[PDB]
Amino acid sequence: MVVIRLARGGAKKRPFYQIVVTDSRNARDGRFIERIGFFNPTAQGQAEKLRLDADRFAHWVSQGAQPSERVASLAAQAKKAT
Amino acid sequence: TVRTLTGKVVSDKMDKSIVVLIERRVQHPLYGKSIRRSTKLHAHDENNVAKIGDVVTIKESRPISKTKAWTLVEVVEAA
Amino acid sequence: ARYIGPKCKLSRREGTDLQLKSGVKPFDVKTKKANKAPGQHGQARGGKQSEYSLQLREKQKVRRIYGVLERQFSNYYKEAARVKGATGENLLKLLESRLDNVVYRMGFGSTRAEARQLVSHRSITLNGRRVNIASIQVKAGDVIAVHEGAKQQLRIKNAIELAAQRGIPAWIEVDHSKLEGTFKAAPDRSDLPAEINESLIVELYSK
Amino acid sequence: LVEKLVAVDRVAKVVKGGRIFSFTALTVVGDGNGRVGFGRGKAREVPAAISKALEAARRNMITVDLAGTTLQHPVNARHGASRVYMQPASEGTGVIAGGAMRAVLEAAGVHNVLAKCYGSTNAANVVNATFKGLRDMTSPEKVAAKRGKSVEEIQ
Amino acid sequence: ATTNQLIRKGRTTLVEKSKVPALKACPQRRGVCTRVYTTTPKKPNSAMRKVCRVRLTSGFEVSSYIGGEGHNLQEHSVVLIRGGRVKDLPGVRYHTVRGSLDCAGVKDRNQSRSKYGAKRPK
Amino acid sequence: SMQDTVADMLTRVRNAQMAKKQTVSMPSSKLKVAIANVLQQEGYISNVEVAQEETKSTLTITLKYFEGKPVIEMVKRVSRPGLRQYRGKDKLPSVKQGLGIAIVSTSKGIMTDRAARAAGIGGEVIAFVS
RNA sequence: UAGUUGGUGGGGUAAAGGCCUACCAAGGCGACGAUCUGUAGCGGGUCUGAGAGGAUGAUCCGCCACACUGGGACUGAGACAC
RNA sequence: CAGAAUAAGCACCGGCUAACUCUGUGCCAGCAGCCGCGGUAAUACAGAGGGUGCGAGCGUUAAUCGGAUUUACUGGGCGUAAAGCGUGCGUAGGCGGCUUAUUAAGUCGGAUGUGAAAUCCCCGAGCUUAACUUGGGAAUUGCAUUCGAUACUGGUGAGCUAG
């Protein structure tokens, strides 16, 4: 099915995740349909920690995408922050 | 909103089918001189209205046989 | 790597004083051999040179005064060429913006080698943290200070005493009581000595 | 006046009993701000050859009008089998040219230029070609005067 | 050429050939010493050059120069050869690496030891 | 045979300038008349005349000299029957940094490259004049 | 090049179609290179070059093909299945 | 916390190309990218002193592009240097005189859709700096559809005589 999950980027021991909408059968860092934000667990200074596009998130959820656990938690965090 | 082509019939021997020659003029990728390129398309003629030498128009469609995917729309000029 | 060994022979070969010595005694009395090259075939400055020789000798002088090796120097030249402006101007600003050079011109070091030793041993703090890399670029507005453990050090006292005799730069605002200074802007070409001819280095690397 | 020695060569003449050797020198002189010339000298030793070359160069002079410290427009020139191309450059470029072109350009006072030689790189012919190109390069005021228009009209 | 002639027939580029075909685009090769002998140079040089005939893993049969003063090579030795021409021994296009497999590094040298494969004296 | 009348016109003008004639005449056509009008407007020639004595028409051009040298020092055909050259508005060539002119045929008529760039259109590059 | 090119009736497929079959016709492709033969996974890209071009297709991403060598099908939404 | 305590090599010095002298040997031993050195005072062979260039690296070999306008589209040639078929006629093809009307294929302009991400470039951010990671742009010079222009080339109709 269609899922919303994190794709790992960055360097060794300093991960940086892209929040993507993709078919679940694809590889973690491979083919995807749409990128809708990012997550940086180790941000500091002027670096942004989390960015999510709520409109496209809701659109894909309505179409039937299934958010993962961490993405659901991040969406709750972003909604609280906004 | 359909793809149409205009050409000249070069054969009508086969049953319900015409061969139309399309001509286009393009620039040579390296030397820049305009050169003539041609292709042959098999089209579909239900009533054999087309003849050799006429200028016709065809449109794209679903396949009708092994090599035919175009259908005649109108005969602009008759030979 | 880093050059270690005889210092005065470099000045004798270059033909001028590159101030690797502290400066308590003049270069001429210190060497007794200036105006002659340090080889067994040492000669005077009146010998003929080629354009390639002039270009090479010009760049070597800057490298020896600033203590920079060839790979880092080529990287510096590439950066200066990429950045807008005059290439030699940018290169000189980049060389002057180094942390160890700033310490030397701020007076806590008698020589750039002493300043580099202090920076490496973490006796100097940038902003509010103990760095140990001498190639760090100091930016406008930065605050340089001596670690409280490194204070009341005889070499630092002697260094500031010699710096007082030396000319204080215009772009550095330094108080010697608490041993702290502020950088404000990159020195300009007129501020820098006119002996150095950056055009030769630019021609060399442009080849 | 800046004086530059482009090339010095030794030449031979055959006589009965052996050979007579001589020297030829080519020089370029220039004020550095729009006046330049070149010359050749022949003598049985180098100092005399050089002096004769400089004398001929100082006799053979022209005036060239630069645009600031660079050329006015791209130039193609040739003398014999040597061809030269020169092009204006922005400030900070320098003189990107071989030795023979560099002598003439620096003597004339150009500071930023890109140049290239095609064909034979014989020094005398290269210097000749660069000389003719610089001599024949034109200027907006001359173009406007010859056309009867104004400089702003020409653009 | 006319632009029409260029359209009809293009411009042809001739393919270059390697100067060291026995290497088969490898940096070095192994071989067995078929022969070890001495040859005379071309004019106007005069000496006794040390050469060896080697059968390579590539399958070819070549001749290689033995550099330096004095060598231990004999028949049936296994050696490593690289490119490099001698320019006065006709038909010799390869060099032998001193100190690699059975070749030994030359003795009594203290300048340019990395070539000739002599270890640093203690 | 004769297959490029524009090149013929340019060659006649160039040879007349090299031989120091005062006028040059040729058989006429509307394309050559347009090119001559552009040259006269740009100031390379003095006067353009067309004499229609019968079905045949003759074009006459008056040449200009300045300081003992011809005003037109270079004229070059660019597009030719064996290789036609077309350019967009962003690729119109500049002749010696704008001190010369390039003649361009556009859908709005024959004009200079400066005028074509001002109007934001392209076309066929006929000749370079300087 | 003779299921070869087109047509009709029938079969077959999730689906158009000589995909298959029985008849009818003599068509179809080719100097704008058919057929035959040698070499080769293709692209985003990488290196070089002032540019135009030249060389290349490791590591990352997309598509295709293969699973000791050849021929098949079954189960299943999906395979002719490391 | 203790103490300078644990830590520097490789190539080269005749010209191209920055950096020279002495011993040893004598067309031998040898060196060599090219030009070339060695046959008794070798700045070119071997060692030593001195020096130069790089530096945890330094040299050699292999391979691609460049220099090479040395396949030349940008951008070359054919009297004697390599290069005009022995000479005609002619098929496919390429190119083609002047005036006028029409068409809008070539040509040109606008709009829309598309040209995945990463990579290259720019302004920032985070790594003690840098490599590296990363936000947002610019670019992707292309392709397709549709709406316009008519100077030139092409098509069609009519007309003309300098070929």
XYZ file of C-alpha atoms in Angstrom, chain B residues 5-48:
44
model
C -0.757 13.572 -40.187
C -0.970 14.667 -43.820
C 0.620 12.776 -46.683
C 0.459 11.291 -50.179
C -0.825 7.801 -50.952
C 1.778 5.629 -52.677
C -0.158 2.338 -52.861
C -3.677 0.933 -52.559
C -3.303 -2.692 -53.689
C -4.176 -4.419 -50.423
C -7.752 -4.812 -49.230
C -9.040 -1.840 -47.215
C -5.528 -0.446 -46.687
C -3.424 2.425 -48.038
C 0.285 3.238 -47.749
C 0.901 6.934 -47.164
C 4.298 8.660 -47.290
C 4.938 11.390 -44.717
C 7.626 14.011 -45.302
C 9.366 16.248 -42.766
C 12.268 18.700 -42.930
C 14.750 18.843 -40.049
C 18.185 20.308 -39.362
C 21.272 18.118 -39.316
C 22.491 17.885 -35.697
C 26.109 18.842 -36.459
C 26.279 20.487 -39.897
C 23.095 22.541 -39.624
C 21.784 22.053 -43.173
C 18.082 21.293 -43.519
C 17.611 17.733 -44.767
C 14.565 15.786 -45.946
C 13.361 12.730 -44.016
C 10.468 10.433 -44.947
C 8.524 7.573 -43.346
C 5.923 5.061 -44.553
C 2.694 4.503 -42.609
C 0.031 1.839 -43.138
C -3.466 3.251 -42.660
C -7.016 1.877 -42.705
C -9.468 2.546 -45.562
C -12.900 1.042 -44.948
C -14.459 1.865 -48.328
C -11.340 2.135 -50.557
